[PDB]
Design a binder for this molecule. Structure first.
Ligand SMILES: [Zn+2]
Lengths: 106, 469, 77, 78, 89, 75
DNA sequence: GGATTACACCCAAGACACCAGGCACGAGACAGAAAAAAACAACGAAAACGG
DNA sequence: CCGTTTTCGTTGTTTTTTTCTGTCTCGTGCCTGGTGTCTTGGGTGTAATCC
């Protein structure tokens, strides 16, 4: 069982997301401090395009996927589902702009 | 607060004065009920022997007996035993228990018979033998046989015959004290009816919904699955009629407490209950509102039906409802339950076995375990009919003590309090033996002893309300 | 890990606190400590309730078991 | 806000407490017990805060209020 | 498609029930009276929302979740009969 | 007080004989010990009665005492 | 050609619970033995007070 | 720390009668047996993806 965090794009087991949270998005999502509904709304088990990144700084793919500022690991090209409107507003409060990785927005 | 505690305690002096007038009243009404002539005409009660017989003529003994072996006659409930070439019959009633032991090639079966001295569990009222100090008894007979299989079959058949005899005697007793009732007169028009009702006790081991009908001289419950599972209850035999709506319950109830017990299926009962069950963040709050609608619907319909029963009785039956606000928790049987006062009775109807205590039938209430800083107490009801067993309500929370004392006073029931659980099996048998001598020596009025009678105290220090240095 | 969702517990805490003084603020660590203490308390209570239920020779915990445990602890009079 | 303590959360707390089967009234009973506990603790904490002449409830107030009840908590600055 | 699950693998759908009330029966709006007559064990949860035999019927229409692998979302051929039966309510 | 005053005194001295040899006692020490002991035992019997009633019984048994001491937090 | 597999559903078992029967170990009853309890008088250790 | 007062703790003896006990029978409540019906498994069977 693995899920893809919608915001940063990382893919980790859903129980890992629940127990420890997203190592990158915890500064704005608080996924560990969030309930299962919020975990699902920010981490989706339905995705496509497993991506393994070794060096974020120099990988052109990471820049193209906007994951060059995140922890190396399992990432998904496309993630099913988008962030909820309330979470979108909460992130916009923090000044961070959310670009969907669902592919429907480009 | 001091003037309110003075006012409350003066109302408590009136509470005590009422309690004293109740003890004196019952003492006068026990001396008037029992005269010295009734004491002189003391009735000695003797154990009744149920007379039985195996055979009247030697011709009645079956021709199968010719084998010099153990022959069983189920029709006459008889175990013929070969004692020195004698066909001696032994009725299954005289037989007690049996033990089979295959020792070597012979099967040694010891058939025990009823013998006085801690024998059968049957009460003294009915003895399986006639009373007799000079009577000697056959306590056990041990037989042996080379044929193990047949001897095992004979033992099984004796055991089965005993089970069938005990079952028939229980069935008779569940119909014995039951008084032969009149026949229910069906209503010649369209009867008033309540559908989808469950009955307690159930007439069959299967729980089935039925329809309750109002007739000219009673009510009829009728199961749709079998016509033979009808329960007829005459209005003349109903003592109390209760209705209980779903105020906290998953169920709605119409309860009939009876004057004479009825035989429903295999069970003798004084109580017949008719019931139905409701059971099957804003969405969960709305689902509770939908359950509250379903409660109110069944409450309205069953209350209306219980009023229509009261109307059909021509004023023989009042419809009672429990005062939930006056309810207290206690253990009359094996579970903690909410005991609910009504107009005329103390009731519990949610769980079986049911409690129905008529307030007018109470002679005295005793509060057991009441003393210095106690966690809980017990309440004992003694009835005016001393033949009726006392009713215990256990673990009533001590927080409810002053409320229960007030409620007993408001109902004109005398009460007494004690630190120790007094035995009533003893108290009652002594009171039954001579009720007149009991009241002559002070009945329960002397036992009450409300007067504190404490003057020793603990001395006093030099009384000086003056500032020292 | 904490078994209650954070926002419901925060809303409950604020609802309760609003009955003693309006416009009160809570540090997030205060809510975290309250949640830890409340869950620890509830787990200990459920352990005592389970002990009572097993004592009565049953498997299902019931409200009377809770009331008995709280009475024996000395919490309800 | 007391309906936010859902039935699954009470089930989870009972499972960590080792409870195998749960009645249907346990949820309301537990909500009442939790409300009483929280009422007492928050009342003590707010007393501490008012005494300190503050408008914010700190972690020290909660820790002292738990020490007051006898529920000493480690790991929050005590 | 009354509801689309955020997972995208399943979705709650509005359908015409196929029941016999006690080889498939023809589609027909769930009739509460016939269902009770043939099966008196109907459940009720809300007004207009009825659960019969473990199946949730809302105002005569079945509401059941179906997998994405259970649907054709393109080249859909509609019939007036079904359109009228769906839009009459 | 239900226990007497001399068997209890002897019990107290016997128990005290382990912690320091030949210890004297005072006017209100044995009396206070007896009051505390009887109050404690009465409370324990209250809890035991509650448990026994919970089990649908009227007889108190040692497992009820054990459950009471477990819930109280006694070792 | 081949194979492992998803998916709905039926036939069935493990489990906590409810009801019934009966046998024995406990309560109730009675006559008897035991020593805790009550009451009495004597001696003085040590508790309460002072500088 | 040292000397004072005088309460109540320790010492022993006699008498009373409530409590402990030996003994019996009965019963009520502990334990074994029969049964409910729910939650869940293991399986068939229809149906399918994959290469
Ligand atoms: Zn992330």
């Amino acid at each position: 069982r693995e899920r893809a965090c919608m915001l940063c794009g990382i893919v980790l087991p859903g129980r890992v997301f629940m127990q420890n949270g997203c190592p990158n998005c915890d500064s704005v999502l608080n996924l560990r401090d969030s309930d299962q509904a919020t975990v699902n709304e920010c981490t989706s088990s339905s995705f496509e395009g497993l991506v393994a990144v070794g060096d974020n700084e120099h990988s052109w793919v990471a820049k193209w996927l906007r994951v060059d500022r995140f922890q190396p690991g399992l990432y998904a090209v496309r993630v099913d589902g988008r962030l909820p409107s309330d979470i979108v507003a909460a992130l916009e409060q923090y000044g961070v702009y959310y670009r969907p990785r669902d592919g429907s927005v480009i | 607060r001091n003037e309110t505690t003075n006012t409350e305690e003066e109302k408590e002096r009136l509470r005590k004065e009422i309690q004293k007038q109740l003890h004196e009243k019952i003492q006068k009404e026990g001396l008037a009920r029992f005269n010295k002539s009734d004491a002189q005409d003391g009735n000695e009660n003797h154990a009744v022997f149920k007379r039985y017989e195996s055979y009247v003529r030697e011709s009645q003994i079956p021709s199968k007996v010719k084998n010099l072996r153990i022959s069983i006659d189920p029709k006459a409930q008889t175990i013929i035993l070969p004692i020195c070439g004698r066909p001696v019959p032994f009725h299954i009633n005289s037989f007690k228990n049996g033990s089979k032991n295959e020792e070597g090639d012979y099967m040694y079966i010891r058939l025990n018979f009823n013998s006085p001295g801690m024998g059968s569990s049957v009460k003294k009222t009915e003895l399986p033998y006639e009373d007799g100090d000079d009577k000697e008894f056959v306590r056990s007979l041990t037989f042996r046989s080379t044929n193990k299989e047949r001897m095992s079959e004979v033992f099984k058949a004796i055991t089965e015959l005993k089970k069938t005899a005990v079952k028939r005697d229980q069935e008779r007793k569940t119909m014995e004290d039951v008084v032969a009732q009149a026949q229910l007169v069906e209503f010649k028009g369209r009867p008033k009816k309540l559908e989808n009702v469950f009955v307690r006790p159930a007439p069959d081991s299967k729980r089935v919904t039925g329809t309750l009908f109002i007739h000219q001289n009673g009510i009829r419950y009728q199961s749709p699955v079998r016509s033979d599972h009808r329960v007829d209850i005459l209005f003349s035999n109903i003592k109390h009629l209760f209705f209980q709506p779903c105020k906290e319950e998953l169920m709605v109830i119409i309860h009939c407490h009876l004057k004479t017990p009825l035989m429903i299926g295999k069970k003798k009962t004084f109580d017949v209950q008719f019931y139905r069950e409701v059971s099957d963040d804003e969405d969960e709050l709305e689902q509770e509102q939908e359950e509250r609608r379903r409660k109110a619907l069944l409450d309205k319909e069953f209350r209306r039906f219980a009023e229509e029963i009261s109307e059909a009785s021509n004023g023989l039956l009042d419809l009672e409802t429990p005062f939930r606000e006056l309810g207290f928790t206690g253990v009359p049987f094996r579970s903690s339950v909410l005991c609910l006062p009504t107009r005329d009775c103390l009731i519990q109807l949610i769980d079986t076995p049911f409690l129905v205590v008529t307030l007018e039938e109470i002679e005295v209430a005793h509060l057991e375990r009441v003393q210095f800083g106690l966690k809980n107490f017990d309440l004992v009801f003694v009835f005016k009919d001393f033949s009726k067993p006392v009713v215990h309500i256990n673990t009533i929370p001590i927080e409810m003590l002053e409320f229960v004392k007030q409620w007993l006073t408001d109902v004109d029931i005398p009460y007494s309090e004690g630190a120790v659980n007094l035995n009533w099996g003893t108290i009652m048998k002594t009171i039954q033996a001579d009720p007149y001598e009991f009241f002559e020596n002070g009945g329960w009025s002397f036992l009450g002893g409300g007067e504190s009678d404490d003057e020793e105290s603990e001395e006093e220090e030099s009384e000086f309300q003056v500032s020292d240095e | 890990e904490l078994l209650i969702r954070k926002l419901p517990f925060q809303r409950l805490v604020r609802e309760i606190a609003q009955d003693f003084k309006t416009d009160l603020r809570f540090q997030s660590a205060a809510i975290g400590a309250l949640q830890e203490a409340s869950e620890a308390y509830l787990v200990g209570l459920f352990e005592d309730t389970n002990l009572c239920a097993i004592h009565a020779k049953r498997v299902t915990i019931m409200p009377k078991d809770i009331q008995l445990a709280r009475r024996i602890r000395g919490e309800r009079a | 806000n007391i309906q936010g303590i859902t039935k699954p959360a009470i089930r989870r707390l009972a499972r960590r407490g080792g409870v195998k089967r749960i009645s249907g009234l346990i949820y309301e009973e537990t909500r009442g017990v939790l409300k009483v506990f929280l009422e007492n603790v928050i009342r003590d904490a707010v007393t501490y805060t008012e005494h300190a002449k503050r408008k914010t409830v700190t972690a020290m107030d909660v820790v002292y209020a738990l020490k007051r009840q006898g529920r000493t908590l480690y790991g929050f600055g005590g | 498609v009354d509801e689309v699950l955020e997972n995208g693998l399943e979705a709650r759908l509005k359908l015409v029930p196929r029941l016999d009330y006690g080889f498939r029966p023809a589609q027909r709006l769930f009739s509460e009276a016939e269902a009770r007559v043939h099966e008196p064990t109907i459940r009720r949860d809300r007004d207009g929302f009825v659960t019969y035999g473990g199946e949730e019927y809302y105002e005569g229409f079945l509401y059941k979740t179906f997998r994405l692998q259970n649907l054709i979302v393109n080249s859909i051929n509609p019939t007036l009969n079904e359109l009228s039966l769906f839009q009459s309510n």
